[PDB]
Amino acid sequence: SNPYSYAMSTEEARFLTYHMWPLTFLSPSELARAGFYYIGPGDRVACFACGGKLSNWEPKDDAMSEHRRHFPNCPFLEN
Ligand SMILES: [Zn+2]
CA of 49 to the centre of ligand 1 (A): 5
Resolution in A: 1.3
In the chain, what are the domain boundaries?
1-79
* Beta-sheet strands, E only, within 1-79: 36-38, 45-47, 53-54
CA of 58 to the centre of ligand 1 (A): 19
**What phi and psi, each to the nearest 5 degrees, are found at residue 58?**
-105, 150
| Dihedral angle computed from the Cα positions of residues 52, 58, 62 and 65, in that order, rounded to the nearest 10 degrees | -50
Radius of gyration of the chain (CA): 12
Distance CA 4, CA 38 (A): 16
Cα distances (Å, whole numbers) of residue 78 to 16, 21, 47, 59: 24, 28, 14, 26
